[PDB]
């Protein structure tokens, strides 16, 4: 199981080989201001998304990064966020682990 697809429609999104240990773990669990919990997996790279609007620094979970919502490009399901404007790396993807399906290439 080396590739991740959108759990709702099957759109190709990312790969196990593209997981990124930010802060020493690719997995981060975080809460938004509405108290929703997200088990976030960091990826260096993703595809098949649509990044919505312009970046925002408000409530950013990752120091020095601004965020844009990442929808599945096919079905519109909220898969995570694209993070940017930071350093080493300048950008990365934080994707919600239970909204993805993992399986064979």
Task: Write out the binding residues for Ca(2+).
Answer: 25, 27
Indicate whether 33 belongs to the interface with ligand EF2 (CB under 6 A). Answer: yes
Residue 81 binds which entry of Zn ion, ligand EF2, none, with Cβ cut-offs from 5 to 8 Å by kind?
Answer: ligand EF2
Residue 75 binds which entry of Zn ion, ligand EF2, none, with Cβ cut-offs from 5 to 8 Å by kind?
Answer: Zn ion
Q: Confirm if 83 and 89 have CB atoms less than 8 A apart.
A: no
Number of Cα atoms under 13 Å in the Cβ half of residue 99: 22
Indicate whether 68 belongs to the interface with ligand EF2 (CB under 6 A). Answer: no
User: Phi and psi dihedrals of 69, rounded to 5?
Assistant: -60, 140
Q: Interface mask (CB under 5 A) for Zn ion, residues 51-80, using x and -?
A: ---------------------x-xx-x---
Q: Where are the alpha helices (DSSP H) in the chain?
A: none
Residue 6 binds which entry of ligand EF2, Zn ion, none, with Cβ cut-offs from 5 to 8 Å by kind?
Answer: Zn ion
Pick 8 or 60: Cβ nearer Zn ion: 8
- The two structure tokens encoding residue 69: 């919502």
- The two structure tokens encoding residue 2: 């080396």
| Residue 18 CB neighbours (<10 A) | 18
């Amino acid at each position: 199981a080396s590739i991740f697809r959108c759990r709702q429609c099957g759109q190709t999104i990312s790969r196990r080989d593209w997981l990124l240990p930010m802060g020493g773990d690719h997995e981060h669990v975080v809460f938004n201001p509405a108290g929703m919990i997200f088990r976030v997996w960091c990826f260096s790279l993703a595809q098949g998304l649509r990044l919505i609007g312009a970046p925002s620094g408000e409530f950013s979970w990752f120091k020095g990064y601004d965020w844009t919502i990442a929808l599945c490009g096919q079905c519109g399901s909220h898969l995570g966020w694209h993070f940017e404007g930071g350093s080493q790396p300048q950008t990365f993807f934080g994707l919600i682990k239970d909204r993805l399906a993992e399986g064979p290439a």
